[PDB]
Motif scaffolding. Structure first.
Motif, PDB file in Angstrom:
ATOM      1  N   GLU A   1      -9.551   5.364  -1.242  1.00 10.78           N
ATOM      2  CA  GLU A   1      -8.881   5.445  -2.545  1.00 10.78           C
ATOM      3  C   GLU A   1      -7.479   4.840  -2.524  1.00 10.78           C
ATOM      4  O   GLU A   1      -6.502   5.502  -2.794  1.00 10.78           O
ATOM      5  N   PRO A   2      -7.372   3.565  -2.213  1.00 11.84           N
ATOM      6  CA  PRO A   2      -6.025   2.955  -2.027  1.00 11.84           C
ATOM      7  C   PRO A   2      -5.240   2.919  -3.311  1.00 11.84           C
ATOM      8  O   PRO A   2      -5.766   2.610  -4.385  1.00 11.84           O
ATOM      9  N   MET A   3      -3.956   3.314  -3.203  1.00  7.74           N
ATOM     10  CA  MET A   3      -3.019   3.092  -4.249  1.00  7.74           C
ATOM     11  C   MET A   3      -2.111   1.881  -3.924  1.00  7.74           C
ATOM     12  O   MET A   3      -1.591   1.842  -2.796  1.00  7.74           O
ATOM     13  N   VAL A   4      -2.121   0.898  -4.817  1.00 11.93           N
ATOM     14  CA  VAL A   4      -1.574  -0.432  -4.512  1.00 11.93           C
ATOM     15  C   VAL A   4      -0.516  -0.728  -5.564  1.00 11.93           C
ATOM     16  O   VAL A   4      -0.737  -0.635  -6.746  1.00 11.93           O
ATOM     17  N   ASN A   5       0.710  -1.011  -5.095  1.00 10.02           N
ATOM     18  CA  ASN A   5       1.785  -1.379  -6.008  1.00 10.02           C
ATOM     19  C   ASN A   5       1.974  -2.900  -6.057  1.00 10.02           C
ATOM     20  O   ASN A   5       1.853  -3.610  -5.016  1.00 10.02           O
TER      21      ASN A   5
ATOM     22  N   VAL B   1       0.838  -1.195   0.000  1.00  8.86           N
ATOM     23  CA  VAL B   1       0.000   0.000   0.000  1.00  8.86           C
ATOM     24  C   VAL B   1       0.855   1.218   0.000  1.00  8.86           C
ATOM     25  O   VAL B   1       1.752   1.293   0.853  1.00  8.86           O
ATOM     26  N   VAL B   2       0.594   2.184  -0.876  1.00  4.96           N
ATOM     27  CA  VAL B   2       1.335   3.462  -0.818  1.00  4.96           C
ATOM     28  C   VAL B   2       0.926   4.282   0.399  1.00  4.96           C
ATOM     29  O   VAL B   2      -0.259   4.470   0.708  1.00  4.96           O
ATOM     30  N   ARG B   3       1.924   4.713   1.167  1.00  2.00           N
ATOM     31  CA  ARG B   3       1.708   5.454   2.398  1.00  2.00           C
ATOM     32  C   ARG B   3       1.566   6.954   2.249  1.00  2.00           C
ATOM     33  O   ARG B   3       0.979   7.624   3.145  1.00  2.00           O
TER      34      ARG B   3
END
Ligand SMILES: O=C(NO)c1coc(-c2ccccc2C(F)(F)F)n1
Ligand SMILES: [Mn+2]
Ligand SMILES: [Mn+2]
Length: 264
Positions: free
Chosen positions: A203-207, A163-165
């Protein structure tokens, strides 16, 4: 403080949220191999201004020069639409829309897969949307925002993603960004008990790779440090007396607009 929307304020959030969803529904048949992200931006802005009689909240935001953000592949967020950037077979692409209508904002984004999916692209988009959906099913009065962040992070990490912090969801209303901060990971600083009438985004940004990111020299474009693919979906919601209502739902979502935890 966190504002509690009045019924009238909520209705205005429904309208703005529907408009922002409708941008995403409108743009879909244009998202094809060979189209430029700059053209997609112009199609969105003309729709917002001329058809919806609304305004994009992105334009001028901290000096940002375009009306939507379009983030391809290892671009995590804030990709700048450009006439020279062409979509191609196998791309995953986030389009993120924020519209202001009658003083209220609606904020939403999704992934589009261009031509034939990558097996990582398919899976990263699906798991990212499911991480959003599992959070949405947790929202109800009396739960703590902290539980929701922790659940998203557990789910994404179990799939071997991160998860982007640096970025989080947020309260929304007459302000694009209001209290609270909606972190997509567990933190000791989160202590927010949800009440009916709070409005915010998840709105999670997931790498696919590691969590670290870097900003390009252009001052805007954010990429994964390891150049892994990154995906995001976003909805704006209102907390209701027994659950939540998703203000930005689209025909292609597969979660209901109104989630209720009563009965049981
Ligand atoms: O909440 C957001 N997106 O869902 C958000 C917050 O800041 C921004 C941002 C940041 C840098 C450049 C452009 C933008 C915006 F235009 F607002 F999308 N977006
Ligand atoms: Mn957004
Ligand atoms: Mn947002």
């Amino acid at each position: 403080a966190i504002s509690i929307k009045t019924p009238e304020d909520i209705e205005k959030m429904r309208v703005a949220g529907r408009l922002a969803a409708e941008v995403l529904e409108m743009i879909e048949p244009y998202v094809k191999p060979g189209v430029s992200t700059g053209e997609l931006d112009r199609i969105c802005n003309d729709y917002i201004v001329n058809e919806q009689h609304a305004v994009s909240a992105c334009l001028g935001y901290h000096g940002y020069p375009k009306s939507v953000c379009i983030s391809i592949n290892e671009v995590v967020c804030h990709g700048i639409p450009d006439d020279a950037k062409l979509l191609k077979d196998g791309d995953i692409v986030n389009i993120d829309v924020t519209v202001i209508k009658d003083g209220f904002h609606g904020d939403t984004s999704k992934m589009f897969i261009v031509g034939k999916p990558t097996i990582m692209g398919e899976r990263l988009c699906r798991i990212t949307q499911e991480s959003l959906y599992l959070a949405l099913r947790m929202v109800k009065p009396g739960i703590n925002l902290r539980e929701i962040g922790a659940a998203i992070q557990k789910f994404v990490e179990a799939e071997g993603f991160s998860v982007v912090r640096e970025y989080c969801g947020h309260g929304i209303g007459r302000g694009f960004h209001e209290e609270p901060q909606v972190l997509h990971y567990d933190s000791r600083e989160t202590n927010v008990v949800l009440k009916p009438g709070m409005t915010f985004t998840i709105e999670p940004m997931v790498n696919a790779g590691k969590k670290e990111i870097r900003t390009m020299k252009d001052g805007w474009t954010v990429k994964t440090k390891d150049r892994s693919l990154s995906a995001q979906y976003e909805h704006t919601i209102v907390v209701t007396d027994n659950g939540c209502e998703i203000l930005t739902l689209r025909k292609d979502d597969t979660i209901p607009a109104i989630i209720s935890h009563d009965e049981a």
